[PDB]
Structure formats: C-alpha cells, structure tokens
Symmetry: D2
Subunit: 257 residues, 4 copies
Amino acid sequence: MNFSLEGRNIVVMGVANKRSIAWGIARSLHEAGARLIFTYAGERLEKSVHELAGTLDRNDSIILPCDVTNDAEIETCFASIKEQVGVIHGIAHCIAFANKEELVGEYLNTNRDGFLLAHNISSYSLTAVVKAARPMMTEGGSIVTLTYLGGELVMPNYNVMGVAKASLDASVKYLAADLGKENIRVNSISAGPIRTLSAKGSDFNSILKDIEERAPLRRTTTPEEVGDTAAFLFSDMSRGITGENLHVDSGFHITAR
Amino acid sequence: MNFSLEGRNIVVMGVANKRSIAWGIARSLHEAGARLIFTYAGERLEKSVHELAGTLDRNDSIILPCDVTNDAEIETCFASIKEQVGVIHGIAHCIAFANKEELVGEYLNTNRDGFLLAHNISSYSLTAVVKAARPMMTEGGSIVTLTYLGGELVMPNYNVMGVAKASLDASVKYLAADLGKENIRVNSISAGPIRTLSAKGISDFNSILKDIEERAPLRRTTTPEEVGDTAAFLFSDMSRGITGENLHVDSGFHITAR
Amino acid sequence: MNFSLEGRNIVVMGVANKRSIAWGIARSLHEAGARLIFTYAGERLEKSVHELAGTLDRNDSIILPCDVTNDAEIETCFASIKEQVGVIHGIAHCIAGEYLNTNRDGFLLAHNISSYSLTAVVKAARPMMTEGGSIVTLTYNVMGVAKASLDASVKYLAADLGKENIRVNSISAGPIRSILKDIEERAPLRRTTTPEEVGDTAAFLFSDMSRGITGENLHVDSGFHITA
Amino acid sequence: MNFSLEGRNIVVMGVANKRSIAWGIARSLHEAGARLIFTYAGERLEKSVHELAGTLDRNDSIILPCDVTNDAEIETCFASIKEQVGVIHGIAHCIAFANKEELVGEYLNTNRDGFLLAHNISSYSLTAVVKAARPMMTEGGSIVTLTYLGGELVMYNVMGVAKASLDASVKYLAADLGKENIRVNSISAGPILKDIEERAPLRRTTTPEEVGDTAAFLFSDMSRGITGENLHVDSGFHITA
Ligand SMILES: NC(=O)c1ccc[n+]([C@@H]2O[C@H](COP(=O)([O-])OP(=O)(O)OC[C@H]3O[C@@H](n4cnc5c(N)ncnc54)[C@H](O)[C@@H]3O)[C@@H](O)[C@H]2O)c1
Ligand SMILES: NC(=O)c1ccc[n+]([C@@H]2O[C@H](COP(=O)([O-])OP(=O)(O)OC[C@H]3O[C@@H](n4cnc5c(N)ncnc54)[C@H](O)[C@@H]3O)[C@@H](O)[C@H]2O)c1
Ligand SMILES: Oc1cc(Cl)ccc1Oc1ccc(Cl)cc1Cl
Ligand SMILES: Oc1cc(Cl)ccc1Oc1ccc(Cl)cc1Cl
C-alpha cells in the first residue's frame, strides 16, 4: 500500500475560512491527490468557499450547501454529490456548534435547548451525514470527525461542548461497529487548540500560551499537522484502524498536571 | 467519620417497581437512616410507588410526581420538596429512556428525533434536576446517577442509549467541577445488567446474564442491593473525597471485556 | 448492609508513621471493628508501628516483620498470621527531574517493591482467605511506571480471585499534607485530600457494602482526576 | 508535508523471521525509503536477520548484535551505529518476553522472576535503548513500540502487566523528549482469531503490513503533531466487549 488518494472522492464539510481546520485538511487531502467536495452552511459562506476551491491547484472541486440540522436539505446535498461524482470514498466532518453564553464559567449556564442544540449540531450531524452518504460508499471508505480533549477531561469553559463531544466520541465507536462490515472506517482526531472562527467562543491566548510551555513538544498544533493526520486516516495506510481517536495536539493529552 | 444517613433527605427519582435499581437504592438509603423523597413519572406510577414506599420500616417517606422532560413540572416538584423538608442532601438520578426500535440491530437505526429524546431524558435530565435542586442544597450534598458499560464500549444493541450515556458520563464530570465549591459531589454508579422493567427492550437478556455468571470475575450477576449499598457509601461522608468518579458495580465484568 | 468490620482480620502493610496513608487506613478500619495485623520492614519500624498500635482503642493488633522484597520472609510472615488467627479477610497494601534518571536496576527495584509485591503477598494470603476477602492497594517518573504495572495487576488479580469471592481494587489518593496551593484552587472540592478520607474509602472497600466492586480504581483526590 | 522516510536512519529491533511484526514493519519503512539498521540477539537470529535483510533492494541496511538485557552491549551497539551512520531518526522497538507457562491459566501462575523478567525485556528495554540512542538523535525523531489490548484490561497475564509498564514508559518518554523534538508512540496490534474475524468491526484479522503502514506514518513527518499516543491496529477490536 501507498498514501495517495487519487481516485478517491472525499467530502470536506465545514470550511468557513482560511483558518478552518477543515480547510487545513482540505489542503492535505488535495496534495495526496484526492478530489474534494466541499459543503457549507447557509449562503453567506458561498463565496468564501468557492474562493478557496479556486485557489486549490487542480480543478476537481464541487461546492454544495448543507445545513446539518435538517434532514431534508441533507439528502439534497448527497443526491447532488452522487449526481456529480457517484462513489464517495470519505467524509471529513468538522462541524460543531454551541451557544457561546453557555461556554462561560459554569457548565450549568446551559439549558434544555442549548444542550439539545449542541448535541444536534456537534454530535448528531455525524450520524445524519453518515446515513446519507452510506448508500454511495460502495467501495468502502474512511470517515473522520474532530473532537477536543474536553470530551475526555474538563477544560475551563468548554462546558456543554465537552458533553456533546463526549457524545460524538461515543457515536464514532458505534458508527464504526455498524460500518466495518462494509469496509467503512470511522475515527476521530482530537486536535489541540488552534485559532479559528469558532475558537473565539473565552480566554484563548491563555490556552495557546500554556501549551507551548507545558506540552511535550513545546509548541502548538496547526491545521497542517491535523490535515496530514487526516490524510493518513483517509488513506489505506490506516486500513487497520477503526473507531480510534488520535490526539494531534503536540502530546498535550499526556500532560494534565 | 460514620456510615449513617440520619438527618439527610435524599430524592430518589426513577422508582417504577420492586425490580428497579432505584428501589435497591431506596432500601439501602432508608436502612442507613435516610429520609426518602420519591418521584414517579406521571400518574401511571403513582399508586405503585406509594405501595412500594409503604413497605419501608419508618413512615416519613414523601412521594411527588416529576416528569423530567419539562422545566416547569421539575421546579414545581422541587418547590414542593423545599416546602416539606427544607434541605435536600442528595439525589439518586435513576432516569433513562430511548426508543426501543433504536436499540435493536445497528446503531444507525436511530434518527434525529430519537437521538435527542434519548439525550434529553437520559443525559440532560440530570443537569435539569440539579439546576432546580441546587438552591436547596445548602449543607453539602451528594448527587449520584446511573450509567452503563455501553457508554465506554460498544455493547451489542445498546446503541444510541450508550451514546446518551456517554453524554451523561461527561456531564457528571462538568457538574462535579461546577458544584464541588458548594460542597456537592456528583458521581455515577455503572451497574452490571439486572432484570428490570427497562431491561425488556434490551433483547436477548438471559443470554447476557448467564454470560456474566461465567465470564464475570465474581462469577455472578449484579443485584440492586449491591448497587444500593454503593450508593449508600456515596451519599455518606465516608465518600467525601470522591467526586466526578464512576464506580463499576458489576461483579468486575468491566475488566473482562476490555 | 453493614459498614462494620467485626471479626475481620486485616493485614495492613506499609505503616511508617502517624503521617502514613497506611495509618489513616489503619485508624478507619480499626474504628469499624477490624482486627489489624501490621507488618514492618526492618527493625527501625518495628518500634514505630508497635508504638502506633498502642494508640488504638483495642490491644488486639498483631505485629510482624515482612520484607516484601523476599519471598521466604513473606511465606514466614503469613505462616505466623495463620498460626495466630487462621484466616484473613483483607490486605491493605501501602508499600512503594526527567523520567530518564532511572536505570535497569532501579527500574526493576521500583517494580519489585511497588508492583510485584501485591502479587507476592496475595499468593501467600491466598490459601488463608477462605471466608472471602477484599484487597486494596494504594496508588514521579519511574514510580508512575511501576504504579501503572500495579494498576494492571489489580485487574489480573481481580479476574483470578473472584471465583474465590476475593475482591481486588485500588485507591488513588491525591497529594496530602507547594503544588498543594494550586490544587486547593483547581480541585473540584477545593482542598487537598486527607488520610481519613482515604481510610473511610478503604473501609468501604474492605466491607460488604462494596461487594459488587472488584478490579476498580477509586480516586480519593477531591476530584482532581477530572481536571486539566 | 510528505510520507517519505528517505534519508532517515531507523533502528528496527526484534526481527526474527518473515512473520515477525518487526519484519512487516521493516518492509513498510523500507518501501518508504528508510535506511534500516537491524538488531538481533545471539547466533540463532544472526542467520535469519542476515538472510531476511538480503530480501530487500536498495540494500544499504546495517546488521549488528544487541541483547537488550546487558547495558554494555546496548552501549557497544549504538556506539557502532553512531560510527557507521552518524545520526538516528527512529527506533522500532518490537521486543517482548515472559515465560510461556505463565501465559496460561491464572495470572497468579507468574512468579517474581518471570514478572521482573517480563518487565525487563518488555518494558525497560525501551528505556535502555532510548537512553543509548538519544545522543545520536540530533535531527528530531520518532520512537515507536509494540503493545497489545492486554495492558488496557484482561485478555495474557503477566505480559499484560508488563505492557502496562510499557505503555506508561511511553507517555513519560514522550514528555521528556518532545523538547529535543523526538516523538514516542505505541502501536497496539490486533492478533495476527475466529473470534476477531466475526466480532471485530472490520470482520478480519490484523496483518503485519497494516502494522508496518501505521508505523511508517508515525516514523514520518505526516504524524509530527502526535506524541505519547497509542494507535490500535486491530480492525477496531478495542471498541468491542
Ligand atoms: N479549533 C480548535 O482548537 C479545535 C480543537 C478540537 C476540535 N475542533 C473542532 O473542529 C471542527 C471545525 O471547527 P474549526 O475549529 O475549524 O472552526 P471553524 O469555525 O472555522 O469551522 C466550524 C464549521 O462548522 C460549521 N457549522 C456550524 N453549524 C453548521 C451547520 N448547521 N451546518 C453545517 N455547518 C455548520 C461552520 O460553518 C464552520 O464551517 C469543530 O467540530 C470543532 O469543534 C476545533
Ligand atoms: N437494569 C440494568 O441492567 C441497568 C444497568 C445499568 C444501568 N441502568 C440504569 O438504571 C437507571 C434506571 O433504569 P432501571 O434499569 O432501574 O429500569 P426502570 O424501568 O425500573 O427505571 C427507569 C425509570 O425512568 C423513569 N422515566 C422514564 N422517562 C421519564 C421521564 N419522562 N421523566 C421522569 N422519569 C422517567 C421510568 O418511569 C422508570 O422509573 C437507568 O438510567 C438505566 O440506564 C440499568
Ligand atoms: O471544539 C473546539 C475546541 C477548541 Cl479548543 C476551539 C474551538 C472549537 O470549536 C468550537 C468551539 C465553540 C463552538 Cl460554539 C463551535 C466550535 Cl466548532
Ligand atoms: O441503561 C440500561 C442498561 C442495561 Cl444493561 C439495562 C437496562 C438499561 O436501562 C434502559 C434500557 C433501555 C431503555 Cl429504553 C431505558 C432504560 Cl432506563
């Protein structure tokens, strides 16, 4: 086996801008020679994403809208991906949401709607996407999601997000039990803190300063490092790996002390 | 210190019948000298809980309805508890639910509706009950909930229930981090399978039991008494150094599996 | 059903002084009515424990020397336990810059004293624990490696001895007394931990209240295990 | 970056025959353009390692003796690696051992010797070799060791205990060495049955190629954000009951 992804069609859901971790993954998958399929939420993000495919070397790229809440316009999105490429070999799911006033101080500032909300977007969406994409993954494939250490441990201010990530963390395991027999693998990457759109939602430079000082590899993670890990996960090089969670975070996971 | 729960009021949510784990927690806590405040899920259970509580040695037990899917009923229920006993010293969270056709076959038999229902009843309800109960919890406190190995590993057919349990597992940690400053500890018991109402709907059960009688280290299945008695510890001050923890009360099965 | 340790004989290994966690454990178990059997390593401690046994309500404690490093001595210590009481219901095992400051022999030695020793003492206690029993062990660098070895063995021990109604578990106690300050600021419960707290947890693990629990690790640390 | 191991010198230890996981691993690092330094314990393997080492093209490989007990000849070994190649970029540690009568029946079948022996060979040897290799590891690096599910909970006995020691020595080695830009990670392999084949997510068993491919990743710059990690190469067996 080798590492390349040529002839592999991968949807990368969740790019917002040049800082999106999805975007760093997009880049690494493209370098490996995959054909990317971006999906975005709304229509305000329409130009920014087209503007990013454009800047990618080869052509390839398709660009569909997909709000992950809403089964209706999820099917639309994948009926369309099938029209335009047919067999899908992979999905990078990099989509989470929480109310930002629930991510301050106490976990307890959350509430029924906010809680269900975080779980719907951050956790359920993966299952939803997988249900859609499944009929089209007929040559087997690989599914990757992004998680944070806060799913495992208590990270100041991650609060309800941490709970939903724990929910996602677990769904990864189950999805993997269901889909291994169709030779589809499901794993997560657990990225270290990196500056993104969604990253503004408390005391951030605090965390980034601590890591370079406290994490084994005295530095911060990048979207590149993550994308490179993603690239391996989407490649057959990782064919033996399913239901795993890989900390791409300078080893910060081993220091809690 | 000591084992006695004399002078403590503990709210046990989730009694349904004599087989329920909450009922095992009930006895144990009552016999350690606690005053139990029960909650049933709507009027179907009203008569059955009154009859169960009536069997206890002392006759101080309180009995209130509380349907955890609804902020208003929750505070209503808790507003009453406050009037009656003034201070609450613990909660036994024993509430779960998910759609039964979701817990057969592939995890993928779930859907947006059921997933969130399962998370709402099974995971959110804890946070819910704590928000409401927090103002009454003024002399320390112990909150205990019930999870299962399915929230750690893939268990055949546990499926979306296990994912909700994982959400629960995490909330236990975040709640504990929020509430240790007010001297309230939050923990879970991870129970081995026991035959209860809710067990039905978890298909091929006496197969799973028999397995645990052979494979389990302690070579025997769990009892609600075992669980109840670990809850007793947890509610008591003997356990005052423990919070955010998860105790497997499961005859050691968790190790023979992993 | 009861928290009492009436008529339980518990060996408590690893008492050095009034500060020992082992000692907190001793107090709490004595308090629950257990009869304590203390072991010492080297005759400097013989007097330290002998002293401490005397602070205990009842003069029912037995004092024996046991160097966990040497099998023959361990076989002797327990033969003598059996002679005096015949049967034992529990063991409390409280014996233990860069990580790269370790070396073959010190590495083995940590593992010998800190890991293997639970297995060694359990092999000896085995044929005398016929009334069922509970075994509890206490858990930085090469020590952390040895502790990890100890943790894994708890599970292997548990899986083997369950058929004999013998439970094996561990307690992880947070720092007890400068690193302290931040814990009292960063700990869920906002305080270091105490040896009473550990002890009352060991009492639970030694009684029937905990009969369904085997192969587990209990964090007595004011919640610090859940924080980053 | 790139998946190429070109111009990296990686020590591979514990090759013994064409089945050896370390061989599966040798092959994969070789394919990616690494220069392999093989080590062997005593004459039995001397032959096999040489005979096997031959198999490969681009044959720039190195062959030397190294008993992982015996601090001196570990020193002897790496002193020589230094002479012949200057700088080391990785170790593939694939050594494990415990008496077989002890990996049968109860865990309590073990004794003081087999216990310590198992820890020596299976856990300490990683520290021994990282210590001896460290000085010559002056261009960043990657250390990768071989574990299994028995260190995580019950499956295997005293070897599971040893692997737990191993697993903890990894996190520690990682924390010490990140500063010098050296990564330390473990692969936990599936069995290399009838059980795994029908109850593992990917409905199949593990191949040494799957293990080698994962290694190539961790030795390469693709995995540069990862340290103190334990990857399960096991058709998802770790997630099951
Ligand atoms: N940034 C970090 O340090 C870090 C660490 C660990 C995990 N993560 C995870 O990485 C993932 C990507 O976020 P990011 O950090 O790159 O920030 P980002 O804001 O750049 O990306 C988040 C994406 O989620 C999308 N999204 C929100 N609601 C959506 C909806 N309903 N339908 C479709 N898309 C929706 C946004 O459009 C955006 O594309 C998230 O799941 C996040 O939790 C980030
Ligand atoms: N029996 C087992 O094998 C086992 C094992 C591990 C964990 N558990 C857990 O124990 C807990 C209790 O379940 P059980 O097994 O004792 O079964 P049970 O059916 O006896 O109790 C479940 C209870 O939740 C209550 N409930 C459901 N929806 C509610 C809502 N709308 N509002 C308020 N209450 C509601 C039900 O009335 C019922 O009393 C659950 O969390 C379950 O997951 C059970
Ligand atoms: O998961 C994350 C983890 C970190 Cl450290 C930083 C940013 C993250 O991503 C988010 C944070 C908050 C919200 Cl509301 C949405 C998203 Cl996508
Ligand atoms: O969580 C559980 C685990 C086990 Cl082994 C047995 C029963 C359980 O409890 C439930 C199972 C299914 C549903 Cl719908 C509701 C509940 Cl309360």
